[PDB]
């Protein structure tokens, strides 16, 4: 039972196509991910925008929805649109739509100014300008948002940034009780599967 289990799994989970070294994952003499060398390379880098944390810094505690009703006066833009685009940008990390980029530009201008004020001439700055049609942040040099990546698959991004404890998902409860459980039970409360 176990063997054909393994066979099915190894056959379905195998990769294909060409890797960064220009060869198949199954190629004879040359190998990829030696001793989880890529795993560690993700460990120390992590997937996050600079723009992401500037925003999550300036917004601070206060309600996302409140902020959205604020940053749109009545005639500005549909709230649903920039709400959607904001959600898809923060978790499920994506390139921000030029809607969200325009809003964030006229919102965060002083934090981006302060992040940009010291930099030497030949080094990468941080800029939101959509003058070019496309949003893919492999297209801007990664200088549009603060991104170091061309692409990150949504699920992994969401897992990674949620491993940072900033947002409240299981913290919906009463506040202080949530924090007391976090302190006294630790994070090791889920060691137990019961």
């Amino acid at each position: 039972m176990g063997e054909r289990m393994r066979a099915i799994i190894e056959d379905y989970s195998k990769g294909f196509g060409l890797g960064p070294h220009g060869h198949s994952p199954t190629h004879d003499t040359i190998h990829y991910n030696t001793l989880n060398a890529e795993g560690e390379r993700v460990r120390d880098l992590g997937y996050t925008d600079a723009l992401g944390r500037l925003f999550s810094e300036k917004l601070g505690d206060r309600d996302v929805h409140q902020w959205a009703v604020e940053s749109c006066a009545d005639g500005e833009a549909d709230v649903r649109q920039l709400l959607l685009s904001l959600h898809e940008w923060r978790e499920r990390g994506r390139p921000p739509s030029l809607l969200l980029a325009n809003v964030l530009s006229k919102y965060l201008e002083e934090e981006i100014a302060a992040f940009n004020k010291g930099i030497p001439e030949n080094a990468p700055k941080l800029q939101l300008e959509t003058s070019d049609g496309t949003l893919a942040h492999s297209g801007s040099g990664g200088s549009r948002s603060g991104t170091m990546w061309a692409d990150v698959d949504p699920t992994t991004f969401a897992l990674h940034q949620a491993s940072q404890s900033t947002r409240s998902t299981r913290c919906d409860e009463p506040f202080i009780l949530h924090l007391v459980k976090r302190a006294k039970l630790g994070e090791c409360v889920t060691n137990f599967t019961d």
Partner: peptide, 11 residues
């Protein structure tokens, strides 16, 4: 104390 048990915390 009821508050300290029921309060949410952003405002």
């Amino acid at each position: 104390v009821s508050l300290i048990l029921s309060w949410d915390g952003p405002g």
